[PDB]
PDB file of C-alpha atoms in Angstrom:
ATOM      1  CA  UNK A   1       0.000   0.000   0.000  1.00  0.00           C
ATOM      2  CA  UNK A   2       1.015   3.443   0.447  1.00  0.00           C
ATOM      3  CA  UNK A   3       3.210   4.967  -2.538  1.00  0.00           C
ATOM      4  CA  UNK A   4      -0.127   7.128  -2.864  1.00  0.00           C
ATOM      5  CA  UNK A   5       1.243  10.859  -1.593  1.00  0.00           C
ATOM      6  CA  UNK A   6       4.017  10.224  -4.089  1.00  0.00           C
ATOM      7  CA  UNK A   7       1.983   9.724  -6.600  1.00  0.00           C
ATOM      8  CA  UNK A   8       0.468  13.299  -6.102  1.00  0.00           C
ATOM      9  CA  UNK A   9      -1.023  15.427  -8.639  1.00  0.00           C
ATOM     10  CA  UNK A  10       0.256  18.997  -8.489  1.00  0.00           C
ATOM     11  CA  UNK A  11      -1.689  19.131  -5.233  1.00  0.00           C
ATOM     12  CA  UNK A  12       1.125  20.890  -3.216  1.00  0.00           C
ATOM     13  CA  UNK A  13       1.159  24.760  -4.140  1.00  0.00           C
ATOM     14  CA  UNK A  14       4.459  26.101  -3.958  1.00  0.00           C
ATOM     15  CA  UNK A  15       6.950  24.332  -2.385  1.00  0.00           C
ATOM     16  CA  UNK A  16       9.998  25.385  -0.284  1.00  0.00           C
ATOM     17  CA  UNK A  17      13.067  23.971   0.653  1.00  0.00           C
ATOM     18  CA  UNK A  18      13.701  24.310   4.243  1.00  0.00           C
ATOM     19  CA  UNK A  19      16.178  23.775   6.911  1.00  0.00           C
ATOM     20  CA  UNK A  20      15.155  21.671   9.909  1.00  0.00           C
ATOM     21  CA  UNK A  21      18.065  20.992  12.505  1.00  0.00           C
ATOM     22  CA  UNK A  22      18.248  18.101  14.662  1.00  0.00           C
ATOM     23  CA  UNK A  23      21.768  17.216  16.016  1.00  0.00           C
ATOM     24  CA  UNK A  24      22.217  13.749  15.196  1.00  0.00           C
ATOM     25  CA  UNK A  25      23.505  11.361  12.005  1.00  0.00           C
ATOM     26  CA  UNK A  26      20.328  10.957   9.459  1.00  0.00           C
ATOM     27  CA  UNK A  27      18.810   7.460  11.028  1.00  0.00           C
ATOM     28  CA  UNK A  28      15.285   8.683  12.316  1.00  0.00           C
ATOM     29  CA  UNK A  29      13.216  11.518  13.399  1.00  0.00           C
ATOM     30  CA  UNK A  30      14.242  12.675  16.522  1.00  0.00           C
ATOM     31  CA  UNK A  31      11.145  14.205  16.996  1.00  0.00           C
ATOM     32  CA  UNK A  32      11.947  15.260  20.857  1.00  0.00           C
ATOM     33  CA  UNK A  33      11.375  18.748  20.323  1.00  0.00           C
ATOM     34  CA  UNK A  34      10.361  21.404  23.221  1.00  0.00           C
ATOM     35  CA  UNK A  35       6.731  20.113  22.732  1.00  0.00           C
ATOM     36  CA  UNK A  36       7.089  16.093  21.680  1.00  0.00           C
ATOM     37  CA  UNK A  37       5.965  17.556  18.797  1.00  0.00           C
ATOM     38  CA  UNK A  38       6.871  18.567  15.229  1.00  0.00           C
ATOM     39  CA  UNK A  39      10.025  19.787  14.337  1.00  0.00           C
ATOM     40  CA  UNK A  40      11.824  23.044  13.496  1.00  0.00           C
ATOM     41  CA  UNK A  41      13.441  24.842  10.918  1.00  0.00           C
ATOM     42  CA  UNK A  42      15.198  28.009  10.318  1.00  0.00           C
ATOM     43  CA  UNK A  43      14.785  30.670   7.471  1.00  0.00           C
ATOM     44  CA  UNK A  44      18.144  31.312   4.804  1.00  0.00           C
ATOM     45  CA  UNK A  45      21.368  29.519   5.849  1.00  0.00           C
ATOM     46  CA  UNK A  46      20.933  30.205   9.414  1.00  0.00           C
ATOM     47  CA  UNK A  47      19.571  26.843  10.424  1.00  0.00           C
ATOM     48  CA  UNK A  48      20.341  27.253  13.578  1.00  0.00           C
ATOM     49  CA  UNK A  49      23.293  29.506  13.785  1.00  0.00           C
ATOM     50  CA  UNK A  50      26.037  27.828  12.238  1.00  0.00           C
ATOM     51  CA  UNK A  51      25.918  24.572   9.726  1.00  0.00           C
ATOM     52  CA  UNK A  52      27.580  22.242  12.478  1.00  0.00           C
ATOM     53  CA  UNK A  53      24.405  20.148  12.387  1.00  0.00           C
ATOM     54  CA  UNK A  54      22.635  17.677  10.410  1.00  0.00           C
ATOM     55  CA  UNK A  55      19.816  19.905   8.889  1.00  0.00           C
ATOM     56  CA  UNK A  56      17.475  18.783   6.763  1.00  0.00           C
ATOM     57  CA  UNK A  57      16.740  20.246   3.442  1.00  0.00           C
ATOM     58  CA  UNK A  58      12.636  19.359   2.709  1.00  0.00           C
ATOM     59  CA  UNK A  59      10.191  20.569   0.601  1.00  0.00           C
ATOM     60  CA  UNK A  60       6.992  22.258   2.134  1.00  0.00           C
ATOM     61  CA  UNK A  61       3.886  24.182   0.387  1.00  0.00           C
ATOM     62  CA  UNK A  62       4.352  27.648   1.210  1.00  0.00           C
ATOM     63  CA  UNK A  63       0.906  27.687   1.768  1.00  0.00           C
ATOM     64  CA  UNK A  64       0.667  25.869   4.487  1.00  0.00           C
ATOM     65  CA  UNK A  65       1.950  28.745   6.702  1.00  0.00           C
ATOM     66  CA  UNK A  66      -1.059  30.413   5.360  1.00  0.00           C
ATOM     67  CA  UNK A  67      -3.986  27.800   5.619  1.00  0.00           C
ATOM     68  CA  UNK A  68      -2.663  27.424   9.212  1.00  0.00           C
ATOM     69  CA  UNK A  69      -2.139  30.747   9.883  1.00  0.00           C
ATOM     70  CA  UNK A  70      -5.915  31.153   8.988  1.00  0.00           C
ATOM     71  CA  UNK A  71      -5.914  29.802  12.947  1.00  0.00           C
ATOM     72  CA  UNK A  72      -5.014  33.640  14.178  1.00  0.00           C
ATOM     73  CA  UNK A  73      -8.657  34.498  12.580  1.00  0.00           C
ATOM     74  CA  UNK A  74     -10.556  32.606  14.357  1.00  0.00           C
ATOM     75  CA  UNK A  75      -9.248  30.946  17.341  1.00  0.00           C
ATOM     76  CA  UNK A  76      -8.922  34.637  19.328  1.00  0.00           C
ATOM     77  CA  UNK A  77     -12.328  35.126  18.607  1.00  0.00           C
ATOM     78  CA  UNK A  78     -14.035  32.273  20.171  1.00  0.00           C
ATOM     79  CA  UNK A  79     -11.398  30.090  21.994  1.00  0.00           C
ATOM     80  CA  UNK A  80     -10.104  33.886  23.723  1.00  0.00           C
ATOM     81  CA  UNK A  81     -12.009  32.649  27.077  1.00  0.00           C
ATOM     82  CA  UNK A  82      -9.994  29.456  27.387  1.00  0.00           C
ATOM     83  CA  UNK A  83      -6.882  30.566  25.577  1.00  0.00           C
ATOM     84  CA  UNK A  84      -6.371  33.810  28.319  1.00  0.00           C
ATOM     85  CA  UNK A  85      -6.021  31.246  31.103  1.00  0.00           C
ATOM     86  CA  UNK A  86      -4.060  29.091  28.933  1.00  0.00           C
ATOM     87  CA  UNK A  87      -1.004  30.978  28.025  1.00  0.00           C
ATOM     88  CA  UNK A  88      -0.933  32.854  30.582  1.00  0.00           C
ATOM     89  CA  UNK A  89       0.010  30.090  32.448  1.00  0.00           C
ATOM     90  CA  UNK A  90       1.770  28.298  29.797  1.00  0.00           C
ATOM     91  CA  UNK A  91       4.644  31.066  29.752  1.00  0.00           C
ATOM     92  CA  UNK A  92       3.383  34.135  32.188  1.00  0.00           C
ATOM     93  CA  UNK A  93       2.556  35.915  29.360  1.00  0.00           C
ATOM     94  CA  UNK A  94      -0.277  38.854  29.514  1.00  0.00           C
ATOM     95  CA  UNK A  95      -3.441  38.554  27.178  1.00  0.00           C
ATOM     96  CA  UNK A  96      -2.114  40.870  24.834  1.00  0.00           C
ATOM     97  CA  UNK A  97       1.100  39.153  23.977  1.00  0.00           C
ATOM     98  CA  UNK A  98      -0.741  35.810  24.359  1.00  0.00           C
ATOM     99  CA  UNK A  99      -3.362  36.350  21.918  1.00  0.00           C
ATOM    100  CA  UNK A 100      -0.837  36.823  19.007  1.00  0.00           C
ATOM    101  CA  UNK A 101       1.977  34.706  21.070  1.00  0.00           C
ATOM    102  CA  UNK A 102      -0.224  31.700  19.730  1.00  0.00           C
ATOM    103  CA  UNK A 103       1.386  32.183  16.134  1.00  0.00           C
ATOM    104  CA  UNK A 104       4.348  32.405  17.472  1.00  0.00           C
ATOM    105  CA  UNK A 105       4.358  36.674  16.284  1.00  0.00           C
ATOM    106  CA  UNK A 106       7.018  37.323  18.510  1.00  0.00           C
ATOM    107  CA  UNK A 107      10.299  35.282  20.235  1.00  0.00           C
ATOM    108  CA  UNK A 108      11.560  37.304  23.419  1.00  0.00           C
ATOM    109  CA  UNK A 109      14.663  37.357  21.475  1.00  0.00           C
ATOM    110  CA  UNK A 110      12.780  40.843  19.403  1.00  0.00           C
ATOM    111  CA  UNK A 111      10.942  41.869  23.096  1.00  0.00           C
ATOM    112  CA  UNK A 112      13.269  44.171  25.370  1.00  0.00           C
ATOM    113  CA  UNK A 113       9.878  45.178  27.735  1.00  0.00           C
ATOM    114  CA  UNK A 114       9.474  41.560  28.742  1.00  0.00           C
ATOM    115  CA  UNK A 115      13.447  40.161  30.638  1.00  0.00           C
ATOM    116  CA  UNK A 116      14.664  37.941  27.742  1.00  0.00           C
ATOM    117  CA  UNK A 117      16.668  36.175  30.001  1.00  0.00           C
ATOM    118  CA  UNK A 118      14.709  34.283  31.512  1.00  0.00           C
ATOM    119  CA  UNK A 119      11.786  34.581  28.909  1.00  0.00           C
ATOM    120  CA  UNK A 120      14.205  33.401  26.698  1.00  0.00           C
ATOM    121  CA  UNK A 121      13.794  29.730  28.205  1.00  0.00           C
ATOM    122  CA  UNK A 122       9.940  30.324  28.162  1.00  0.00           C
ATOM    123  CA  UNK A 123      10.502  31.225  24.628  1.00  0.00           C
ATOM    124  CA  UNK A 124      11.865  27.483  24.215  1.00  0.00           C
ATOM    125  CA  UNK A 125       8.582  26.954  25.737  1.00  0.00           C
ATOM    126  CA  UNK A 126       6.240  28.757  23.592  1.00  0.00           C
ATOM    127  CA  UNK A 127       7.547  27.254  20.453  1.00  0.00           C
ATOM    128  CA  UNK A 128       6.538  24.325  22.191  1.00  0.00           C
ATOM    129  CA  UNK A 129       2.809  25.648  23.233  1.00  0.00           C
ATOM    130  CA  UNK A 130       2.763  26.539  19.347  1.00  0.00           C
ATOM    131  CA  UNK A 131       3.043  23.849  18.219  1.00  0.00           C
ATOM    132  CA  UNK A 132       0.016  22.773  20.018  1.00  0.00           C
ATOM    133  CA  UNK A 133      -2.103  25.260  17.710  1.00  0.00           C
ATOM    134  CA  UNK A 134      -0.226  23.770  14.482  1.00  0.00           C
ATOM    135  CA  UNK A 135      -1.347  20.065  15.993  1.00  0.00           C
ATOM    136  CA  UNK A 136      -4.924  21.153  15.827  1.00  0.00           C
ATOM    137  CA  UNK A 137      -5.218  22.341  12.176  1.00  0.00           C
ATOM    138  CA  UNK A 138      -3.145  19.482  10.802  1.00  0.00           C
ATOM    139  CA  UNK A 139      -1.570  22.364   8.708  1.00  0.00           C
ATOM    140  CA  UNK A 140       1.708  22.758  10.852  1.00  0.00           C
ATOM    141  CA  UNK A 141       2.147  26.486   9.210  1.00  0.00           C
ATOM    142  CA  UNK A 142       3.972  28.509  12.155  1.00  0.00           C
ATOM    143  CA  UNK A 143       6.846  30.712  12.214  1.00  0.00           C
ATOM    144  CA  UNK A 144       9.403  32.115  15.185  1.00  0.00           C
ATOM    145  CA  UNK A 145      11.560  34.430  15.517  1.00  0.00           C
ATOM    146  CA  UNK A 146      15.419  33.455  15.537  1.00  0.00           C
ATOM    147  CA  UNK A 147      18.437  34.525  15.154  1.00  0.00           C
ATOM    148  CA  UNK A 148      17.837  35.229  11.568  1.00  0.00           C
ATOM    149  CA  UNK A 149      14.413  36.573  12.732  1.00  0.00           C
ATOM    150  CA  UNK A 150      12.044  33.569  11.320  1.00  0.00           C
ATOM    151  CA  UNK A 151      12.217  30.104  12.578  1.00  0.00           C
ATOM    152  CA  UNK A 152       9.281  27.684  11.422  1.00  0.00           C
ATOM    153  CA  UNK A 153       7.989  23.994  13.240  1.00  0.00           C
ATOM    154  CA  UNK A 154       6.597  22.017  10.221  1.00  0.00           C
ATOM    155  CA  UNK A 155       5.691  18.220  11.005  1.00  0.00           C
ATOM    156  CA  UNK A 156       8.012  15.281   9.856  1.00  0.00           C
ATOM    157  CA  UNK A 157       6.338  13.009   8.044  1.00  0.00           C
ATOM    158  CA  UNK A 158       6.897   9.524   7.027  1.00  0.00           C
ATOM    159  CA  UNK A 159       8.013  10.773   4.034  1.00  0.00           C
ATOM    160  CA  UNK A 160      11.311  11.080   5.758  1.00  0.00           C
ATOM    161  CA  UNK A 161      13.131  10.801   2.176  1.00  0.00           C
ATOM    162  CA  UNK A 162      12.054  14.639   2.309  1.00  0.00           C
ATOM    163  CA  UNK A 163      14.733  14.970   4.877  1.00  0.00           C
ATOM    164  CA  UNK A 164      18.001  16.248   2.862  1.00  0.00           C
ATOM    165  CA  UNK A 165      21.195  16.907   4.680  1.00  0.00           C
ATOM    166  CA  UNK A 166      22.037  20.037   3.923  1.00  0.00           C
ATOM    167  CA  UNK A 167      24.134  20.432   7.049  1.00  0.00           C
TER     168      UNK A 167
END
């Protein structure tokens, strides 16, 4: 069985080729990131500062950032009740920076009101707690921001042969 996704029919609009970084030799998905969840990768060569790693060159629709993101329409409008209790106890964050903190719209690492030294941990954690929102839509779609300013956590298939070293 299976074979089928490969077999695909210009269904995927616009791919890009990423970096995702997991220190290891290519065997299998480490898939132990800050969240248990799906993994991350960096914007331009910057995959995570240096190439010392094994990244992983993949392709992903560059649409899928945007069918997810369609998530930061609707979820503050009804889930706003549950979400305010939620994040701000996920990462101490207030409403206001929780609301678009759910999209992952801004790392501590761009924030100088909020102490991004120890925020900067939480910040760890919120690209975990985002990737919560990208495991609801199935569309993993989200963005950071890093070093080079955008990070994205995109889900690793089975497809695994998607996973180029690129180091």
């Amino acid at each position: 069985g299976s074979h089928m996704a490969s077999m695909t029919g210009g269904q995927q609009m616009g791919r890009m080729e990423i970096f995702h970084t997991s220190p290891v030799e290519i065997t299998t998905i480490n898939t132990q990131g800050r969240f248990g969840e799906f993994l991350c990768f960096a914007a331009d060569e910057y995959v995570m500062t240096a190439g010392d790693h094994v990244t992983y060159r993949i392709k992903v629709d560059e649409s899928d950032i945007i069918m997810a993101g369609s998530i930061f329409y609707h979820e503050r409008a009804a889930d706003l009740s549950g979400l305010v209790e939620r994040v701000m106890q996920l990462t101490g964050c207030d409403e206001d920076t929780a609301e678009e903190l759910i999209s992952q719209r801004i790392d501590v690492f761009n924030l100088d009101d909020i102490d991004a030294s120890d925020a900067a941990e939480l910040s760890w954690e919120i690209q975990a707690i985002t990737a919560k929102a990208a495991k609801t839509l199935g569309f993993r779609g989200v963005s950071m921001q890093d070093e080079q300013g955008t990070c994205y956590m995109i889900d690793m298939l089975g497809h695994d042969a998607e996973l180029v070293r690129v180091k």
